[PDB]
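Troubleshooting log. The previous run stalled partway through. Resubmitting the same eight chains, unchanged.
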Amino acid sequence: FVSNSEILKPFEKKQEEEKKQLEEIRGNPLSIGTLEEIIDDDHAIVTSPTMPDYYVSILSFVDKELLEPGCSVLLHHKTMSIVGVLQDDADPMVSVMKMDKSPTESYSDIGGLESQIQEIKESVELPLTHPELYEEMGIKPPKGVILYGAPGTGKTLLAKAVANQTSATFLRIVGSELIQKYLGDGPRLCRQIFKVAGENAPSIVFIDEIDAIGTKRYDSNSGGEREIQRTMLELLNQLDGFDDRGDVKVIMATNKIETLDPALIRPGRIDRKILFENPDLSTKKKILGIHTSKMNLSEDVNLETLVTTKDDLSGADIQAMCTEAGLLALRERRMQVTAEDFKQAKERVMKNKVEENLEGLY
Amino acid sequence: LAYAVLGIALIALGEDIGKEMSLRHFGHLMHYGNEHIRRMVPLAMGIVSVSDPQMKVFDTLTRFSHDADLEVSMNSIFAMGLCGAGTNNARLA
Amino acid sequence: KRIQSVPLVIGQFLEPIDQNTGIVSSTTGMSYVVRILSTLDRELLKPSMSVALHRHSNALVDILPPDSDSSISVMGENEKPDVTYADVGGLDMQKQEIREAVELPLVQADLYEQIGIDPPRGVLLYGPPGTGKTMLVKAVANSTKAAFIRVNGSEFVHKYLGEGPRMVRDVFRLARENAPSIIFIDEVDSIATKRFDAQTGSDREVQRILIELLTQMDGFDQSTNVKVIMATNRADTLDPALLRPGRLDRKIEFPSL
Amino acid sequence: ALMYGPPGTGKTLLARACAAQTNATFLKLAAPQLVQMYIGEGAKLVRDAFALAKEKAPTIIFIDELDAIGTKRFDSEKSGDREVQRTMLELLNQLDGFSSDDRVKVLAATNRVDVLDPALLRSGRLDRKIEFPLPSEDSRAQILQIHSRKMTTDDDINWQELARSTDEFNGAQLKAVTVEAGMIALRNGQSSVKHEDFVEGISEVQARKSKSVSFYA
Amino acid sequence: REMFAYAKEHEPCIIFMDEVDAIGGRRFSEGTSADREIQRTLMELLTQMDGFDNLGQTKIIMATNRPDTLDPALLRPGRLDRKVEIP
Amino acid sequence: QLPYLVANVVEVVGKAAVVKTSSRQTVFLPMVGLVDPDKLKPNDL
Amino acid sequence: NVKDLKASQRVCLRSDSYMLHKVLENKADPLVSLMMVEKVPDSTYDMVGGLTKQIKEIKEVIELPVKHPELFESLGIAQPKGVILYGPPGTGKTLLARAVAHHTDCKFIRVSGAELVQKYIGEGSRMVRELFVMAREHAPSIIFMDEIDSIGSTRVEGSGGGDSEVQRTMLELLNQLDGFETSKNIKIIMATNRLDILDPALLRPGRIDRKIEFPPPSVAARAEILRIHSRKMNLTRGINLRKVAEKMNGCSGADVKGVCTEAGMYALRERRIHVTQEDFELAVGKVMNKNQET
Amino acid sequence: LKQTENDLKDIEARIKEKAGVKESDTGLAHPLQVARCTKIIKGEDAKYVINLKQIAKFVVGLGERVSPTDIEEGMRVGVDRSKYNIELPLPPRIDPSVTMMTVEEKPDVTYSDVGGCKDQIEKLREVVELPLLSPERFATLGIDPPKGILLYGPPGTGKTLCARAVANRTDATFIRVIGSELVQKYVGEGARMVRELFEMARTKKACIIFFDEIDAVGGARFDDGAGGDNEVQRTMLELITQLDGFDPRGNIKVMFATNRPNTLDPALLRPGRIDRKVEFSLPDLEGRANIFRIHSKSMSVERGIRWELISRLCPNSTGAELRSVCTEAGMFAIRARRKVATEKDFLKAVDKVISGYKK
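Second attempt completed without errors. Output:
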């Protein structure tokens, strides 16, 4: 009380005086509005949402060199004087972005894909970790990277893992859905993405499964060819227009990369095109090892035995197998999972991958 | 009083949540005025952040560097040099 | 009494919040929270109804029979419409089809319910109009001696927020009140051919009018004494809520053959 | 009249000339401005144009584009393109309304003739259909003599000779040679142009046609 | 409504509709931008026709270059029945 | 004197005359020669 | 107090004093853009009955996770991402979705894919992002995607890639849920009988893990479906549903519902206050006539 | 410290402001697209009453008014898009645009290459650089310098980088309009933007208006519309008109970019639209060498590099590809943890880049 009160009363007093004087002038109902522009006659033209618009004086709460257009400010009754400034609302990462903040997984949990991991690293994780090489040398780390592999198998895993390691907002775009089939929707959607990303940097623009603007055409006509081409061109121009060493990073994703033009990749910004190699034997042990941790099982299971008979199979297969084996236990009314179950799941997935007869198996 | 907050680092030894509670805590310290308090905070933050490094503590100390209160800037930069120790250079460059 | 008297603004009651207090939306665009009278609070109080508002008072002056109007042109009521079995003979399949679908619940709701089959509540008519189809629709209304309410369904299409939702609401209410009745939707395909494949954009204003029509249509007609008949220049697909059982249950064809 | 055929010769420039000569008020009316997304207002604009044009007579109404009092197609997308059918129709209905009196002229201009409603079949509409060809040796040479007043030359330059040296040049392109002839001059430290300076100008791009061909081994 | 009412008073009358594609389209592509205003218009003309009010001292004459952006409703007898062609 | 109210008309017991104001409102005035016939012509303020 | 107020609260504020005097209710916008809640559904397994093979399968994939989550986690099986139902059209694809929703006592949320096709900048994008938020609050849920399905029970709607683009988004979102949140309480239901609405993400593991088969009705099965529909209404009491059922061959669950409604017009004409067995035989004869089409 | 000084500023600002509000209250009260002084008690004609709106009109033909200095009132005020006009109370700027575009005053990317783009840079230099530095030279000759430039080969060839660099040197604005966005499907909207860009352009004269991609918009016109070539041609045809219709040459520059050369129309080629065709397509062996040499100066390197050898492995390149070889070569070194670059690394980067470009 009393100890506090002696420091408190004057510390209270300077803030209160400023505040008092503000509130009297600021007296409600005061309409909130948007700065349209800040003018040559030192006025600001404002767009009022009450429908008039005005040339307005500023009361320096913070200065005009600290204020920019489109910012929200609080406006007087009629002359619309800037009585105080406001913080912006409804930042649009809740409308064009599906957000995965501090996403899961890491490099250790799929390890054995180690050589590819260094590649992905060198463009994304590593500049953050060690700025210095990149700065001293004067050349920039690749803005954007392309991952090709397959969903839930290796493409997605690498992307979760790296993004989390750099502690950037993984912001997930559905490529196909941009796909909106009418002249106005896509190029804006794309612009609005890039804008919000650069503002609230460092940020990951993850474009999932872009297959459908992967065409280029020699001539453009009509609406039926031009729409597609406008969307493609918008990505190409923004890249070509700006340059960033990691205010915006891009991961582009597609199953295979032979459906992307080499003139949309754009060497010299996107320098890395990184592959997906299958999990080998060491990796299978690992992928399994992580998935058997979560489990309650029987002691007759041999992690080793099942890996050895698997012929160079995808990380997907390994996930699938665990998921499949749990079901054979659940149906039989039990929580223990015997070896025989893992083996049946392994036999089934291994057959389907290794089916390709008379042209693979000649 | 200066020593009480210094003491809290040593009390918060072996205590997982409490290390987290520090980030809530130094918030409280900013509310409370007084030169004795303003001088103490770079040091409080410095001791905790070299027996448990805090990105938040570095982020705050950069601002204290460019402080118009003389004693605060003094203590922040010595503190900041304490955090960067263990290497020569890093972010510290 | 005198304080609460003409001139008056019209509003609509949306819902009662608590005792002696109600929310109204007036038609202008200004929404008010107002008092209701204590002798209007009990036994005359409906959750949505049409009201008489004072323009200074901000109080419930009067409760209105629901027929409050819109800045769109008013719909047509024709008690005993004058087309009454003109064209007949050789329309044998289409006359029989109409007859069991449209006439019988209006004369007797109660037999359908007793069987326990659902009565047709809404019917969809497809094939040309003005070539044998319309004639029959009008004739049925006249023979059942129900009011023909000819309701202009390409006329929601107002270009403003919601006048149009207010008007549909008035019309379904007024139909159940003035039962037996036909609400006849001329070209329903105007306010319900939209998004099946992300084509036929620009139809954001009719989406509110659509929700309003479904809540009124399905929520009444539980025994059926008021029929809705849907009309389309040939055929058009509709948004999935109309088409499912409980609404447009009979889908009647005009023969190619 | 309706004109189509290539500008880049001074199509715009000719239109204004006619305007000056007859003592018409030149009114540039931009076809995209009518084409309003709002009701009718565009129809009214067409009528106001006639109304002022009739008060100001002589007048040429010079129509930038033809893509928005036309391009209506013959398909069922002529539905969407209503605003453009209506602005046009009215302007024609209004001209034949007053065909005997010559007060107002209508000229439309484009690179090339577009799909339109019939209107080339009638005196009171846009009867006349005027083609622009390309220049010839006499024409290039006059165009060069107009050019050579404006800017310095060393007064030795022979338009006829340069005209033989340029193949399938248009008027605008002879004007871009004069600029390139000056870019040689700019590098050379000359303030005029000799014959050579112009010959070298032709060799460089003008961006639609340039005579410089002599490669093949 | 005004156009029809006045036709009845001032009957005989010619009601001349200049290029019918805008009050009697077909739809742009089956889609809509503004081609619902066209439908709102078009239902009103079909309604007066179908109605109890009958055309005989009010005559309506439709004009358009092409019949390939007339609605199918109109092309059906009983909303137009007489079709004069220019030979 | 301006500010004054104009009216944009598009309209060509005793006689009634309808004026259309640009505030999009129709108003009654008489045309009994209290208000002269030559003060109405369409298309005009 | 400020803890009564919240973001997106609807409040009454004095026009007189500008003081927020009471709180109404919170509002929303996707819930009236053709997305909707249907609490405690009226579908049962007896409704489209004769689903035995499916019943056990569907119980384990959907019902067990929902009823008992801890159990799935500890056992060593992560919860299945999606189910796609594939089998003959017009059965009770939609019906099944609602039945399961009822059983676990979860909210049935019907999504029209195309509606989620606004032609403005992002408004469509916005609704898609909000669809997930809403369902996370409303957990548990069956999120049933309408307009990917061809069924005679409701209607075949959907065309183009306009519900294939949407169908993809649903599958990304399941990754996302196992992802940063590490939860799943929300299961997404595909139904289809069509090859021109599929994805390659549909065909991919770790993206959708169960393909559960929808049986064709049979003579035993038709009887079960028929039995439910005739005992929600008035009927003769000596009835042999078995007899009727043998007469229908080829006929989906939707047809068993049509038989009753066609039988009813016969009952209604002859001014009965119940339907009889007779009407049902004649009704089966009517449907068989249609199937045989030239 | 920081807090007391911020309050001191508020207090000071505020008092002036309160007084000023009351004065504004007593009188009952620049870009703009119509003027709208919604009252006008103060101020043919001998007094102003000007208010340009659909719902009402107040019309006076005569502006000026050095006393009272007009303006005030219901504030949007200045010149009109109907020409009644607030002529000269508080700065009008010829119907000035409230529709924005992205402005980048002095874009920063200086001189990416100066060797091996030697001719292409020099073309820019004559047209753009020298007429800002000396207008009198150009004048004396009597020539007008190229209005428009077309830059070809693929975009992002270092096409952008070079353009930006001359813009920095002259202190000139980049005015970016991106072709693809314009595309609306609502009546007239795109062409409207184009008129206001040029009105705005004339005000801001000394500017490079960058028009991204003519493959995007104005790609055909041979269709005679289609719904998607009909707004698109409308925008396009309007944009040309403005250019031959005159905007000042030797100030305002328009630069076009194109990946592919099959979109071009005779309308587009002609002078008063495009005059220059600058290459950024395929350079020489000597040329590839210079651009390699130039990006690796800034880098540390350990010895044994000859640029000629690096150049040799390219059978055909574009400028984009070259930029990729230096930067990729550096990455192999960083993985091994290195600051220096080696002959081996450069070879390794050529092999990767070309092969991906194929197909």
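Takeaways: Chain E is about 30% helix and 10% strand. Chains E and G do not touch (no CB pair under 8 Å).
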